[PDB]
Amino acid sequence: ILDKIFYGVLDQGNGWLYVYETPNQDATYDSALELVGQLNKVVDQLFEKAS
Amino acid sequence: HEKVTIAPLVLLSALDHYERTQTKENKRCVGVILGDANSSTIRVTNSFALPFEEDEKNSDVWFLDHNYIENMNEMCKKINAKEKLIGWYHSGPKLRASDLKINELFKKYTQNNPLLLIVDVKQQGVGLPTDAYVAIEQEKTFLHLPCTIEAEEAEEIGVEHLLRIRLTNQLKSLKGLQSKLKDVVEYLDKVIHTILGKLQDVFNLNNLQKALTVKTNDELMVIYISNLVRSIIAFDDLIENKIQNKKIQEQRVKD
Amino acid sequence: KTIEVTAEINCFMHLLVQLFLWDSKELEQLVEFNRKVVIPNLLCYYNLRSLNLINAKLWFYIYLSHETLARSSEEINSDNQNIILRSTMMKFLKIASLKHDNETKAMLINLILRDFLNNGEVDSASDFISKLEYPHTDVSSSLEARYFFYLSKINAIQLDYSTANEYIIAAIRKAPHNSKSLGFLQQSNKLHCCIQLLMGDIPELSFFHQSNMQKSLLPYYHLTKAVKLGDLKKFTSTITKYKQLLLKDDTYQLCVRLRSNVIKTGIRIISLTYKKISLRDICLKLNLDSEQTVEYMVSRAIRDGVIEAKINHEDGFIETTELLNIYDSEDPQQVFDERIKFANQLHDEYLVS
Amino acid sequence: KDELRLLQEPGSYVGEVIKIVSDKKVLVKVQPEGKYIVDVAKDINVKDLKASQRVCLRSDSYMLHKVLENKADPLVSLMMVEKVPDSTYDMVGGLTKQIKEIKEVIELPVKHPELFESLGIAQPKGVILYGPPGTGKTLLARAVAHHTDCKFIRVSGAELVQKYIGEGSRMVRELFVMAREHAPSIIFMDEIDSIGSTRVEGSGGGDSEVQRTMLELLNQLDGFETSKNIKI
Amino acid sequence: TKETVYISSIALLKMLKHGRAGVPMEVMGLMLGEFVDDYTVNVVDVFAMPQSGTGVSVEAVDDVFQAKMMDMLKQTGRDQMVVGWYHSHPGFGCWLSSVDVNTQKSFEQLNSRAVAVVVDPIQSVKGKVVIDAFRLIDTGALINNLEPRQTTSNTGLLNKANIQALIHGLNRHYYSLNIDYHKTAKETKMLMNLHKEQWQSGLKMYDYEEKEESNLAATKSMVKIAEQYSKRIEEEKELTEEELKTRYVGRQDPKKHLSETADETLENNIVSVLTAGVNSVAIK
Amino acid sequence: YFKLKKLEKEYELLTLQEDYIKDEQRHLKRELKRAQEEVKRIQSVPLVIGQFLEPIDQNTGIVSSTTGMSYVVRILSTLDRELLKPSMSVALHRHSNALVDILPPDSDSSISVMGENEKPDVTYA
């Protein structure tokens, strides 16, 4: 499971099993990567133009 | 099913015969549409009027010349060969008893199901100044086909040269329930169920969306995630322009 | 007579530089001499080009030296020159027409607020805040950080760290001058960290390590581990040794407020994650201080907004919650209006640009 | 809005001024069409018109519009002039006899043209390489136009000749026009090369059409034009 | 003043419908109405004629077909005075119809003020709607009101006017066509509300709701790529310039790439907000 | 006092001017949107292919049409230097004869075709 072969999680206390769907994420945060890279560069570039 | 496509050339042509003939409310200008009814898309590329006379005292009295009907349809074949008799159009806001008796005239020379069109010069209420209906029997049964308008390239562009949202959508949506409420009350006292059965089918089909309400709010947040990122991009240009505006002011002080 | 008075003041402001930290003349005759050269209509009728020509920035650090162990020396109740000064100060604002007054309005309030910080009552200072708030466009960048410094300190005594948060942010970003970045910034950074003391976060030393000397780093480092680990013994020994630094900054009040935060912060540090927490496990944790206070200690921390729990006296446990949920309908919509409100501060950039 | 009105144009051809007419007209040869007598612009005097001057002729009224920059726009097959040639004589180095023969022929008149005129012998305008195939001469070809600071030009006689009407002449004459303005350059003659760099063993059956043109332009360039510093 | 032709709503649309058959071929028609010089000029009704084997000439018009059709104009209220003959031609640089010569000279005998209209673009359509005409002058037509002063006449700077194959003579004498339009209160009320883009109208809510929402999943992924190429342009923009001068032929460098990161961002966010307000609007 | 009353009337006329500037600001965007829609309708499905040769000046260019002739077009304001290719296949307008778009690097033609495989089913080894 940790090798991304089988998808699921077990239960040690009661000896049970739980359901885990195959996709863990859609495409959302990939757009935030473009925002973090912009605010860590263009923002620092603004002071170079002012100073 | 089939759909009715009315070109802007036909809609504007029917409005001209009304003013030139000085037609009052006592008369209704009748005309003949021309097009191809064979396929599912019914397009009308030509229209012309006819010397029609209306009598309000007797609905069975109408004056129509069949000689001008066949002659003009034959003489206009030289322009385009795709123009045949698919039906006819007439004026007036309402359908009187004289309109039902004139439906069987053009059916002799018409192969497929004829098409009826009602031109309204006033255009009072909602949309669709021109409504299209089909005449078919099993008792006359009329069905309203979807009315669309599509023209050629030079015809659609020529309109833009002569002319050189959310609030309106909510106003007409509210009036739909007010007009439907009056139709049910008037029909209730008229009988004292078949007509109301069709309206009940649409009216019945957070009531049913309660199961999807939880999943709807989760999708609205993802939409705001994109809007929040685009808003920050627009905010960076404001600071960039503010610094850029100072560079112009710095040149004015030295020079 | 505007030019004649201004020409005489030009020679007066040059002497005031000597009267400030340089040459104090006499500690008696000078304070009486500086009063008679101001009152006789130097501010006049507000004719034209009248500002910055009064005392203003110069007299902040002057009169505080004459009041302490100079003219008074605790031989009287208050300086008679300061009593007349409070009469002239509050008369300057009473005769103000609120037209071109921007920088001169905020500087005089700095005296009545600073006086309440040492000897006086700060409850009456809240009434001056309604009058103090104005969109001052003439305040220089050096005094913009000081104007935000006093507004954040008054709210600290009023037990509100939320309002004082917005003022202290813009205070450390301003005043680029070297003297303001050494003595004024180190004193302001300790007040900025004081807001974190009442909040319960108390972040580690990253930017503040090289920004200030080791004088302010020693007490903050000992208070960081004392409040986080929830140890009142180490917290008590810190107040005793550092008492000399706590009195000059008026931070001695942390022996009560911050002491109560030692328990509140230690709640989130220790793991309450499990549901039913027995009474004996609570007594063992947090040394022996949590043994005497068990049910009452958790009762107030829940209403204050720290955690959310439930106490059961029948079986002798306490049901606790870590505040963990999943966004479904109304959960993600709580921050929806907040993120829009966060952008409202950036919506003013359209008029600025 | 002012740009939208400028974007509407009937079009303008491209031609070159031939002569000047006393009738306030001009004879301009339109390359895609031919020689047409047109009108000179009213804002441009007829005295500024020179020979083979690149100008702009309107399509609608067939007359001169304005005067563009003077250049011959090349039709590009293999003949595009490159920039920043990358090579050196240290990479193909190690041959003592070949370098001495190249310098005394190509590089010698370029640096010191007065040595040939003072001695009384004409400077060599061309050379033919000899040797076995694949000696590494492909890399040194870039260094010939590099160290001499000349224009890098390669000529393919096959791609400049077409069976279409007028396409087997104007292409060849295009090389002669730019060779005068680019004159500090060395022209490379390919498709005849047996040296082994690119070895087709020459073409004697495909050059029958171009021999009536290219052979006349190469001989007239040296004899009639007397333009030096041009290496064929 | 002169006669300024005012094209009605139906007058412009029928001219494109009559010449609809073939690019090279040609048709004709008759303009109608009554008008007086010094303002009024109007064309009430237009109708075409069958294409003959002679193209457009004096023998092209059929008096038999015209007389049989003219009797139908009276009963329908369509009967008016004939003000001219409009044609359709592929068009040339000058003398757009090579087969049309002796027509207008025979037309000016009946009425000297009659004109002839030809649709210029015929597959060249642009959207400025450039239409052409011709009217003969020869001897006379002078000692009258001012023809040129009306609209942008008294020209000939260089040779440039219109098609620029004309200069002075055009066809003959530079009739200087003037093309305007006038409509009644009922005709103007139509095309304003009727013609917008396409017909979803009367309810905008659910028509494009399902179509736009179904592609919103793909739209979310496509707008992310546009932002990826946004900052990469501005990053390389300030990295290569240590000067702040122009050797760079960069006369306006920033505003182009700044607007590409702004207007595109301004386009993508508004379509995800204004449409999102009506994307649900469920209430109960 | 006469000059002081005259200065008051000067700013009263500017009061209506401030609100009127915002009226033209929202009205110009409606006319600016119509100008942007006109630019989008120029290209459309009708476009001719040509060969770009060398740039000259802004809103000016020298190209070679595929009809056998050569014309001088006007380059768009978008393409200037970095986005402008020295020699590539580009799109041109038919009647207006202006620059449209840079065509993709298509080297294929009707004569002497070049085949290209797409999703081969041959398995290695």
Curated annotation (Swiss-Prot), chain A:
N-acetylated by NAT1. Belongs to the proteasome subunit S9 family. Component of the lid subcomplex of the 19S proteasome regulatory particle complex (also named PA700 complex). The 26S proteasome consists of a 20S proteasome core and two 19S regulatory subunits. Component of the lid subcomplex of the 26S proteasome, a multiprotein complex involved in the ATP-dependent degradation of ubiquitinated proteins. In the complex, RPN6 is required for proteasome assembly. Present with 16800 molecules/cell in log phase SD medium. This is 26S proteasome regulatory subunit RPN6. The lineage of its organism: Eukaryota, Fungi, Dikarya, Ascomycota, Saccharomycotina.
Swiss-Prot record, chain B:
This is 26S proteasome regulatory subunit RPN8. The gene is RPN8. Present with 19800 molecules/cell in log phase SD medium. Keywords: Acetylation, Phosphoprotein, Proteasome. N-acetylated by NAT1. SMART domains: JAB_MPN (SM00232). GO terms for cellular component: proteasome complex; proteasome regulatory particle, lid subcomplex; proteasome storage granule. Gene3D superfamilies: Cytidine Deaminase, domain 2. Acts as a regulatory subunit of the 26S proteasome which is involved in the ATP-dependent degradation of ubiquitinated proteins. GO terms for molecular function: metallopeptidase activity. GO terms for biological process: proteasome-mediated ubiquitin-dependent protein catabolic process; ubiquitin-dependent protein catabolic process. Residues 4-138 form the MPN domain. It comes from Saccharomyces cerevisiae (strain ATCC 204508 / S288c) (Baker's yeast). Belongs to the peptidase M67A family.
UniProtKB/Swiss-Prot annotation, chain E:
A motif (JAMM motif) lies at residues 87-100. Residues 5-140 form the MPN domain. GO terms for cellular component: cytosol; mitochondrion; nucleus; proteasome complex; proteasome regulatory particle, lid subcomplex; proteasome storage granule. GO terms for biological process: mitochondrial fission; peroxisome fission; proteasome assembly; proteasome storage granule assembly; proteasome-mediated ubiquitin-dependent protein catabolic process; protein deubiquitination. It catalyses: Thiol-dependent hydrolysis of ester, thioester, amide, peptide and isopeptide bonds formed by the C-terminal Gly of ubiquitin (a 76-residue protein attached to proteins as an intracellular targeting signal). GO terms for molecular function: cysteine-type deubiquitinase activity; metal ion binding; metal-dependent deubiquitinase activity; metallopeptidase activity; proteasome binding. It holds the Pfam family RPN11_C. Zn(2+) binds at H87, H89, D100. N-acetylated by NAT3. Keywords: Acetylation, Hydrolase, Metal-binding, Metalloprotease, Protease, Proteasome, Thiol protease, Ubl conjugation pathway, Zinc. It comes from the Eukaryota. Its EC number is 3.4.19.12. CDD domains: MPN_RPN11_CSN5 (cd08069). Present with 16400 molecules/cell in log phase SD medium. The JAMM motif is required for the deubiquitination and degradation of ubiquitinated substrates. Belongs to the peptidase M67A family. This is Ubiquitin carboxyl-terminal hydrolase RPN11. It comes from Saccharomyces cerevisiae (strain ATCC 204508 / S288c) (Baker's yeast).
Curated annotation (Swiss-Prot), chain F:
It comes from the Eukaryota. It is found in: Cytoplasm; Nucleus. N-acetylated by NAT3. The 26S proteasome is involved in the ATP-dependent degradation of ubiquitinated proteins. The regulatory (or ATPase) complex confers ATP dependency and substrate specificity to the 26S complex. Belongs to the AAA ATPase family. This is 26S proteasome regulatory subunit 6B homolog. The chain holds residues 48 to 172 of 428 of the full protein.
